[PDB]
Design a protein around this ligand. Structure first.
Ligand SMILES: C[S@@+](CC[C@H](N)C(=O)[O-])C[C@H]1O[C@@H](n2cnc3c(N)ncnc32)[C@H](O)[C@@H]1O
Ligand code: SF4
Ligand SMILES: [Mg+2]
Lengths: 414, 126, 164
RNA sequence: GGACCUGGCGGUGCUUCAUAUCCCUCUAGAGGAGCCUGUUCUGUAAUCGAUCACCACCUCUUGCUCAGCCUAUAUACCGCCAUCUUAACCCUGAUGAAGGCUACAAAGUACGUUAGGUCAAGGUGUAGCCCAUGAGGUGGCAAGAAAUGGGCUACAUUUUCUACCCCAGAAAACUACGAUAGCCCUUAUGAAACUUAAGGGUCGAAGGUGGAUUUAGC
């Protein structure tokens, strides 16, 4: 509990209260509506000029819904447990107490239900175009929010090396140039699908197979470089680890990315239970280092969004996601601004900068007459459902909560 | 064990779709309210909804197929299709009960026309 | 020292604007391990001044740069690899001097400082030439450099410069 | 190691063409005004937010009634929607992998899922504050500018007014055309009309045909 009525008070460092209004209190991390660069927008529209009819709207909606509702691959352990349970249940039933071979077939038939069919998506040129038109803006917005976290809290950071695993459309590269464009000199992009590499190159050349790149220093690769010697300043993986077919692949990929991380490792996934579980698996992997004597001996910690390194309090049943609003790319079906729901985790080398860490709001703040509802993940490792009022917590605390929003930090001490 | 190893009867009413109501199906409720110039359509609809809920709750698991609610004058005829699972004495008890209760709730001479079938009369498998 | 990745074959094809693997008309050593073997066979280059020729993608360039050379002079004839070599130069500040021109015609006697010129009778004068060039141009160069040794001019104004 | 079989080539190029959408052509509009929207930036102690809400100040107190609260929770169920998953026979090759057609015919025939939304209480619960998430009062708060995204009137002569419903008379580019622009007043409906709608008067603004692109069509 980071909020005890009457005890906890605002942390006034740099005199923000006296020298600044409350809407610009340090814990504000809200990003305005995200608009894509004109270059990327024109390139995407030019590349989809060939075929942007009614079929494309249906395909985009279907693909987006399929990606959003897709579950993690079911490992053999849970399938074995389910099979044993259903086998016992069928043995109990006199009608279904058939022979073993017949029984096993019925259990398999019922397991075809109550389980998710995970299928690898083979992204060809057509499916690459559909995924582009369906997720370019959303990925850009999510990655922009993730990077804005780092800047807003650490504006002295001037990266020179970026790597992107599962770089499908170049969204991470575009955001990184839009943000740290004056210090980055190389953009390593990795993708097993050749069609996406071609599409990203074409987009970077203004939607034309021949042109001059908007962003200099981009490298495109199909295989993940595996070597601890080459260490990047920032490593990013956006909506990529969910494509891997098994937990072992996620384990090895996350270990490699952490080994090749210099300052920051950013993981971004859909804001569902599956993505949250995947990101917590990656978090527990990185935090609980198992390498006996790695080349880089620096420790790691969670820079965002968690104010602690304990197991997540929401991983039992619930999730933890954030929202970023953005202006969708102009199309025959994109009119109104949208909201992207995504889960994120940033792991940084070294140790926490100070001990005055602040709670994170993990849910929309609800404003009501003379009180505010905030769901706060405390640095002690617990959630707190807080109703802030001026009389109980103080005028400054109440006003700071009044101006705060989803994904902000509440500046409290003791 | 591992993933690649792994990798409904309907009655005539149920089988046909809503775009066949005047082509293959008919209307379960039949009354003059919806005709041009006639009034009290909403009252008839509310009465119909209550009738269906009550009849399904007073004959649980007995109704094989949907009710047919007919209206002639102030008469109210509930032509129902039920099963032969319940005892006939209980059927007679419930028939008298429902007739009297609905007659006194709607202030009209209600009447009930059970038709028992051995089992659900399936048309297709969807 | 953090260096950019070695270009792959596909990047080379796109850089040469060939769009195919059949009009390459060149052979590239894109294994840093063999290049490190070569530079190992070139001797001990610590605090040495190297004059490299025919870098191309730059595997030999990277291998020499990992060794603690004092300054590495590159002569490249293609403008299309100068961007990659400039990125390498940015990665290693002050140890890479890229020059556009022919290796048959470049004048090395002015390239390095005059304090390295050691007498002929002494040991090799702390300057080294390393080269993985096309076989159609490596023979005129060795003939020319043999003539220079006979006259003790050109790259051998510094003394008995070793070649690899 | 020799010979052979099925292949796959997520294959690579060329000649022909059906080559429909999309091009081009044709026509029709629109794109430049004056209404709105959504965003951003700037600025506010505060919200250009639907009496209520917000900001700055104060007051009340066991009170209304063992009070009171349009508070949270469907991330409690239920339900209403929405997302995703759910062959046989007969011949040939020595009875090898394997293969099987000729028409004036030569073996071929047959329910679960969801940090989903929706209590702008469909219902049943669960928690919150209860000298303040309750009840009052006094002031203030009724922002400013671009942009880009798109639903919105005419620019006049094949025009406008009158008669008429197609054989008429006038006016015509500065007393020309045009406003669903502004202001005032009447009527309608309602307890209530700056609120909403309609009519009359006032007014007679831009507009002078708008390129790239670009919107439609059989
Ligand atoms: C669908 S994209 C996700 C969006 C993308 N990260 C972005 O920035 O918008 C993920 C990509 O990762 C690539 N990928 C999946 N598994 C991989 C693997 N094992 N090795 C290399 N790339 C892989 C796929 O080709 C896929 O295109
Ligand atoms: S901030 Fe807290 S609730 Fe959210 S993901 Fe991190 S540990 Fe979990
Ligand atoms: Mg107001």
């Amino acid at each position: 509990a980071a909020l005890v009525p009457g005890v906890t008070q605002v942390d006034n460092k740099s005199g923000f209260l006296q020298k600044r209004p409350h809407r610009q209190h340090p814990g504000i991390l809200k990003l305005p509506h995200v608009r894509l660069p004109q270059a990327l927008a024109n390139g995407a529209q030019l590349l989809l000029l060939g075929s942007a009819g009614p079929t494309m709207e249906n395909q985009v909606q279907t693909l987006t819904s399929y990606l959003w509702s897709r579950h993690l691959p079911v490992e053999p352990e849970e399938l074995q447990r389910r099979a044993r349970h259903l086998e016992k249940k069928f043995l109990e039933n006199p009608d279904l107490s058939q022979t073993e071979e017949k029984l096993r077939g019925a259990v398999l038939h019922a397991l075809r239900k109550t389980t998710y069919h995970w299928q690898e998506l083979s992204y060809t040129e057509g499916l690459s175009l559909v995924y582009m038109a369906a997720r370019l803006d959303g990925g850009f917005a999510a990655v922009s929010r993730a990077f804005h976290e780092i800047r807003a809290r650490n504006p002295a950071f001037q990266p020179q090396t970026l790597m992107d695993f599962g770089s499908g459309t170049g969204s991470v590269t575009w955001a990184a140039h839009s943000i740290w464009g004056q210090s980055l000199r190389e953009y390593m992009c990795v993708d097993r699908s050749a069609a996406m590499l071609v599409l990203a190159e074409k987009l970077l050349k203004g939607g034309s197979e021949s042109g001059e790149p908007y962003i200099p220093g981009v490298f495109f690769r199909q295989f993940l470089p595996v070597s601890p010697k080459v260490q990047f300043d920032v490593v990013v993986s956006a909506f990529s680890l969910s494509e891997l077919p098994s937990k072992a692949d996620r384990t090895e990929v996350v270990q490699t990315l952490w080994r090749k991380t210099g300052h920051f490792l950013v993981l971004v996934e859909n804001g569902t239970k599956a993505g949250h579980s995947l990101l917590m698996d990656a978090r527990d992997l990185v935090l609980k280092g198992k390498e006996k004597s790695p080349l880089d001996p620096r420790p790691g910690f969670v820079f965002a969004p968690c104010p602690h390194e304990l197991p997540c309090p929401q991983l039992t049943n619930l999730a933890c996601s954030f929202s970023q609003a953005y202006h969708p790319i102009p199309f025959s079906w994109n009119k109104k601004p949208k909201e992207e729901k995504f889960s994120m985790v940033i792991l940084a080398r070294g140790s926490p900068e100070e001990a005055h860490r602040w709670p994170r709001i993990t849910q929309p703040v609800l404003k009501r007459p003379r009180h505010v509802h905030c769901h706060l993940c405390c640095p002690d490792g617990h959630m707190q459902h807080a109703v802030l009022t001026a009389r109980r917590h103080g005028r400054d605390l109440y006003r700071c909560a009044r101006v705060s929003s989803w994904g902000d930090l509440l500046p409290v001490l003791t | 064990r591992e993933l690649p190893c792994a990798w409904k009867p309907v009655t005539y009413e149920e089988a046909h779709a809503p775009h066949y109501i005047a082509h293959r199906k008919g209307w379960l409720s039949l009354h003059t309210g919806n005709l041009d110039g006639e009034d009290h359509a909403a009252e008839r609809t509310v009465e119909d909804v209550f009738l269906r809920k009550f009849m399904w709750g007073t004959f649980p698991g007995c109704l094989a197929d949907q009710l047919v609610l007919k209206r002639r004058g102030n008469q109210l005829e509930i032509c129902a299709v039920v099963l032969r699972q319940l005892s006939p004495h209980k059927y007679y008890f419930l028939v008298g009960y429902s007739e009297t209760l609905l007659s006194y709730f709607y202030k009209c001479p209600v009447r009930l026309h059970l038709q028992t079938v051995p089992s659900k009369v399936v048309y297709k498998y969807l | 020292c953090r260096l950019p990745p070695l270009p792959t074959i596909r990047e080379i094809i796109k850089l040469l604007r060939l769009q195919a693997a059949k009009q390459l008309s060149q052979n590239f050593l894109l294994d840093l391990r063999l290049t490190d073997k070569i530079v190992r066979k070139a001797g001990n280059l610590t605090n040495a001044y190297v004059y490299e020729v025919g870098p191309g993608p730059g595997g030999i360039t990277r291998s020499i740069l990992n060794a603690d050379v004092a300054e590495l002079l590159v002569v490249e004839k293609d403008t299309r690899f100068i961007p990659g070599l400039q990125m390498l130069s940015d990665a290693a500040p002050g140890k890479l001097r890229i020059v556009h021109g022919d290796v048959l015609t470049f004048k090395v006697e002015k390239a390095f400082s005059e304090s390295l010129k050691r007498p002929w009778e002494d040991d090799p004068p702390n300057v080294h030439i390393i080269g993985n060039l096309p076989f159609s141009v490596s023979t005129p160069l060795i003939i020319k450099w043999l003539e220079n040794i006979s006259c003790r001019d050109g790259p051998f104004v510094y003394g008995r410069t070793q070649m690899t």
